[PDB]
């Protein structure tokens, strides 16, 4: 057993039929030493008395908010959560596997620039009693300050007649070096709590590898009796632009003809019912492309 945070603990269990579980001794954080009663969750049933309480934790029915009282007054709280180890593996029932870039991938992170900010999102089929706790750092031996905010619902969709709930969180590196050569990776650690169930997930990466710029800005068409295309860098991309350069790809889409350039403009051939789209990528590093920015042709 170990403490996740104040008055919150985790019990690691080997999850198998008729497993005996672990014996846990809960101590009421209180000065007084007599006339003490324990309870669980909302039930008034007195489970024991005294300074301490011994319990065998083997099923979720044995977990929950253990509370000690003395004269009706609430003295101390102690919440117990369970971490299933199924045949030597921790449980991963909460989050849906994205299977990209590889199996057993639950977290996907991105960054719109080298500023030091980035965003990580994950999916789940759960809708209630769901809580996440996010932490991050650069380096494991000696970690560096990385501040993470709160995880909140970003979208809701249906996939295979079962609802999908997307969560997202924003973080930021305390003292960033946007132009530097990242030597140590970012470490992201997530605690997931569904009811009393405890699970935690992880991801490691450099920022330069997860870059995905925003689509080009102000996409315009200038015809000529065939068409001249022009755009601008996005607002979120890093600055100055002569340092953090971008490259682009122009597509006319029946077929899809594509060209590449480092300029903010290009000339192409337009056709009826066609569409012109453009996306961007870091000019010097092969990171992720940007979503298309489109303008109907003709």
């Amino acid at each position, epitope marked *: 057993i170990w403490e996740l945070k104040k008055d919150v603990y985790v019990v690691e269990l*080997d*999850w*198998y*039929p*008729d*497993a005996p579980g672990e014996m846990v001794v809960l101590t009421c954080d209180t000065p007084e030493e007599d006339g003490i009663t324990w309870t669980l969750d909302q039930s008034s049933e007195v489970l024991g008395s005294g300074k301490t309480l011994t319990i065998q934790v083997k*099923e*979720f029915g044995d977990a929950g908010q253990y509370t000690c009282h003395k004269g009706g007054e609430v003295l101390s709280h102690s919440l117990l959560l369970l971490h299933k*180890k*199924e*045949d*030597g*593996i921790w449980s*991963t*029932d909460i989050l849906k596997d994205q299977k990209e870039p*590889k*199996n*057993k991938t639950f977290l996907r992170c991105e960054a719109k620039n080298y500023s030091g900010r980035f965003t990580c999102w994950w999916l789940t*089929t759960i809708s209630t009693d769901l809580t996440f706790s996010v932490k991050s750092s650069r380096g494991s031996s000696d970690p560096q300050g990385v501040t993470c905010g709160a995880a909140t619902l970003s979208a809701e969709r249906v996939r295979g007649d079962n609802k999908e709930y997307e969560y997202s969180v924003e973080c930021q590196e305390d003292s960033a070096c946007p132009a530097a050569e990242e030597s140590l990776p970012i470490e992201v650690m997530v605690d997931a709590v569904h009811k009393l169930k405890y699970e935690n997930y992880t991801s490691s990466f450099f920022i330069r590898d997860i870059i995905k710029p925003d689509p080009p800005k102000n996409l315009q068409l200038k015809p000529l009796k065939q068409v001249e295309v022009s755009w601008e860098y996005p607002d979120t991309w890093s600055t100055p632009h002569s340092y953090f350069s971008l490259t682009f790809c122009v597509q006319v889409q029946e077929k899809k003809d594509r060209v590449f350039t480092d300029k903010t403009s290009a000339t192409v051939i337009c056709r009826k019912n066609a569409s012109i789209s453009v996306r961007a990528q870091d000019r010097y590093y092969s990171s992720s492309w940007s979503e298309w920015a489109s303008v109907p042709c003709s």
Partner: antibody, heavy 115, light 112 residues
Framework: QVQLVESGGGVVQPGRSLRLSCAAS????????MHWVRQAPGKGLEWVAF????????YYADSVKGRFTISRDNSKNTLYLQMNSLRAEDTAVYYC????????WGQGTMVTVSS | QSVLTQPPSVSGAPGQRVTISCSGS????????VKWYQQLPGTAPKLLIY???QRPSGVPDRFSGSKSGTSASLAITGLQAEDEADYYC????????????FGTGTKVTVLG
């Protein structure tokens, strides 16, 4: 006392279907996952499929993907395995094993695919 | 989509020691644990070792397991006629997570 009992096996021609049943007892069936394992006479073990505690996610071996279908009914404490488009190489004994450290195995039921 | 490598046959006289290897890769044995089973001619497999080296109840102490890097080993100290049987090692792959990886099997034979 944990116990598992397979049923539904027998003989069948190729191409036809068959449904297998593993009756559980002695523990909290709905709180654990379950496997399906087979072994040809005098050969080694080969994993077939697996299903989680809540039936949320199901997994299959690539030699039976799209053909077999696994299911459970926690209300009656049983585990199923629907085998469709059977093939000759599927001839074997089919056990149900629990998922966990101290796992348990049933007696198994024979499945013979032969014209 | 993977298998573990065990020696087909191992042999030894009563009272002697014998070892059974379970070789794999970094994806499976190098990142996961190892189980050992005992299958007697006319029954289903019985669990001998779990989490590499642990012994359940009802399994003597002579059955001792281990794991090193990409390979594991089950040691039977002090043979007996009853120990003559097939043995299988099982583990998982870091990417075919729940799928079970069984070994080739090992026929233990008592001679002398």
């Amino acid at each position: 006392q944990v116990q598992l009992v397979e049923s539904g096996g027998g003989v069948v021609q190729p191409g036809r279907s068959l449904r297998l049943s593993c009756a559980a007892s002695g523990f909290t069936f709905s709180s654990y996952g379950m496997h399906w394992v087979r072994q040809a006479p005098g050969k080694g073990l080969e994993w077939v499929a697996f299903i989680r505690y809540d039936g949320s996610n199901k997994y299959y071996a690539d030699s039976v993907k799209g053909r077999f279908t696994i299911s459970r009914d926690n209300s009656k404490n049983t585990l199923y395995l629907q085998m469709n488009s059977l093939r000759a190489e599927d001839t074997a004994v089919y056990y149900c094993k629990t998922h966990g450290s101290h796992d348990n195995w049933g007696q198994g039921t024979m499945v013979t695919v032969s014209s | 989509q993977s298998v573990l490598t065990q020696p087909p046959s191992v042999s030894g006289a009563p009272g002697q020691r014998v070892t059974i290897s379970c070789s794999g890769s970094r994806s499976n044995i190098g990142s996961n644990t190892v189980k050992w089973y005992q299958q007697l001619p006319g029954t289903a497999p019985k669990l001998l070792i779990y989490y590499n080296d642990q012994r359940p109840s009802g399994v003597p102490d002579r059955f001792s397991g281990s794991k090193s890097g990409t390979s594991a080993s089950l040691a039977i100290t002090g043979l007996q006629a009853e120990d003559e049987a097939d043995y299988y090692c099982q583990s998982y792959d870091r990417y075919t997570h729940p799928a079970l990886l069984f070994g080739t099997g090992t026929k233990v034979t008592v001679l002398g």
